[PDB]
Amino acid sequence: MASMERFLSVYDEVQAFLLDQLQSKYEIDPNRARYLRIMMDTTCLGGKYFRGMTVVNVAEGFLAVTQHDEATKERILHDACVGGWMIEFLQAHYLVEDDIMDGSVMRRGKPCWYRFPGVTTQCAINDGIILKSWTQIMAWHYFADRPFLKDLLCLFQKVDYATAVGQMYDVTSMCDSNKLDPEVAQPMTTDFAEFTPAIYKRIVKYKTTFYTYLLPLVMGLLVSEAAASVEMNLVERVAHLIGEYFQVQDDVMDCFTPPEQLGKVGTDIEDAKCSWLAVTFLGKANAAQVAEFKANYGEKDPAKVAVVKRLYSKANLQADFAAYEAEVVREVESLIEQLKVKSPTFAESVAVVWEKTHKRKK
Amino acid sequence: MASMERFLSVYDEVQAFLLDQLQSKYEIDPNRARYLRIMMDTTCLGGKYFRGMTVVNVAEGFLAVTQHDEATKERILHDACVGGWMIEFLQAHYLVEDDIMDGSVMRRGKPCWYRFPGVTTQCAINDGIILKSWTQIMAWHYFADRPFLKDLLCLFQKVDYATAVGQMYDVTSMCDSNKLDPEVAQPMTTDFAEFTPAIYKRIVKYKTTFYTYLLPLVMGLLVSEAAASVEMNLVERVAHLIGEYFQVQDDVMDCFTPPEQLGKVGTDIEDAKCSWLAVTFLGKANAAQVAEFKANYGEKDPAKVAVVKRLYSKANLQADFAAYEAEVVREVESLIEQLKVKSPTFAESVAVVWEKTHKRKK
């Protein structure tokens, strides 16, 4: 069976499980089950499934080099698919809550879930809560007798918690740290002193890299009982590195990819986000460029946003991006080598992960 | 050491642990740690700690009848306090998210967390996420080598998930089930056909009774290694029964307790909630009373809300409440007896829990 078809089939199976349980254990009625069914489909389906499929790809790579009964290959691939949907549903929780937090309009060419007419914020906050709760129900049911259950639960919770802390770093990135204060309404920075490469790197490490790259790779090792084929410090290192590059790409597209192709109107500038573009611009600007940036960044006025886009265009940030890219190519290729000492297989999976990111066009 | 002082001391210990970890593992800076510290204090402290202290009370009752080394008594009471704060922090997650969902203003005489000037909804949704994440970090750290760790994690997740499903039942209780539909903006019921005792009971069972009464009692059994001193079906039965009574009290106070003493302006009527008062009123009203209720319920207009309060007052709902109360006194006293077959101790703890609820004046 082809991996994607397996993956999709298990979605159906998990969905039926979750909704049937609601009916047998939680007294749900047909109409609320249907609401939840729709919510699950709308919030979990329609992406590329890169995260979830990476768990399956990692587990297929070990199946090719490890001796097992056919029924054990099937059980490993079924566990890889369940674990991959745990990650997809965890992403769906974060996207639904993030979209409400940020006042987002669209995602992927469709309205954000909270904007659906019959959802509203009052239901959507709780729908997002439920999405994450469903990851736990999956694990306790499908993995109940598995040796990896503790490790997988403990990894998932650390990853979830990192991601929430990253969300906190992201949404406070345009404030001065020393002025954070629940009692006092928060002004936008005026100095941009915290728009640095290391502070950027912190935000991105936590907000995206743990759930997007670290979790899929490590979940694939866990469902395969293969965590001894790797040096975990290397897998963390490469995950964080590739995931940073991924976010840098996102940041560039937020500004420059036209909305119809982006699936969104990008507002990082108006939102005063600490984006790769802002940090890299500041890192090369002269005094007058810095002043013009300060006078225009973090405002809804479209003329001011255009002045920012103009400044970035004139600043030849494509060049700094090519330099960044070269350096990441270099470091990721080194880490893949350190990963071969223990597993060619695991290294190849990391190689694919890299190729898909590096060569992604959307 | 007195139980409450122990309990409070462990708060300090857990808080320090959580913030120190943020600094050693998650790259936090001092100012964001301080933000989180304040958020934890504001959202977790200032109640009666009834839920968390019930875990400690249940564990103290078993200590009086079970032989242990002093160091084991201390470890049990420390685990009971950690487990009690897991429950308090889980409540704090639900209160912060519920207040945003419902557009609440105050809680306990202070602004809701999201309304603080330097919080805002964008941070508060994620702060609530973090609150629940902290319950997991507590458990994996304090209970890492404990025999009850799996059982406690599995119970906590089922309770969390029930509570979210209860939130869904609560916020959709004024819509017709057969019209739920993410695509279509939801009208208020006009028939009130779903304002029934059984539908009420479902809402309350899930929204409040699992986290408020079932979880504290069962966590106390788990940290004591005492789940064989009970028949779990009875503990579930009594938890749900007492927790229903608790909510009925809340519902009555929402309408009739003056705001300064309530800590809140009550809006259940304007919000068209399926409250005990509405269900009980409908269950005794004549045709003209039902019509007047329909014409006035679920509106912000204060004249219409006063017409509802008037209808409830004239309807002698104190009498139906006394009848309800008598019946609950009767059934809870029976369950306490079935609970004595296996544990006098556990029965007494349930007795205290009941007394505190029955005789609570706030």
Ligand SMILES: COCC(=O)N[C@H](C)c1ccccc1
């Ligand atoms: C829609 O964008 C076209 C496009 O090639 N996007 C990819 C993802 C990309 C690569 C490198 C830097 C920025 C963006």
Ligand SMILES: COCC(=O)N[C@H](C)c1ccccc1
């Ligand atoms: C690929 O995105 C659309 C786009 O026009 N990007 C431009 C060429 C760019 C700017 C800054 C950094 C990298 C690339």
Ligand SMILES: COCC(=O)N[C@H](C)c1ccccc1
């Ligand atoms: C502030 O309310 C006074 C008061 O006694 N409240 C308690 C909680 C109560 C008991 C029974 C029914 C309703 C309310």
Ligand SMILES: COCC(=O)N[C@H](C)c1ccccc1
């Ligand atoms: C105790 O709350 C304040 C209050 O005036 N309550 C009244 C007496 C009441 C109405 C309906 C049901 C029970 C009690």
Ligand SMILES: [Zn+2]
């Ligand atoms: Zn965001």
Ligand SMILES: [Zn+2]
């Ligand atoms: Zn972006």
Ligand SMILES: [Zn+2]
């Ligand atoms: Zn609510």
Ligand SMILES: [Zn+2]
């Ligand atoms: Zn209430």
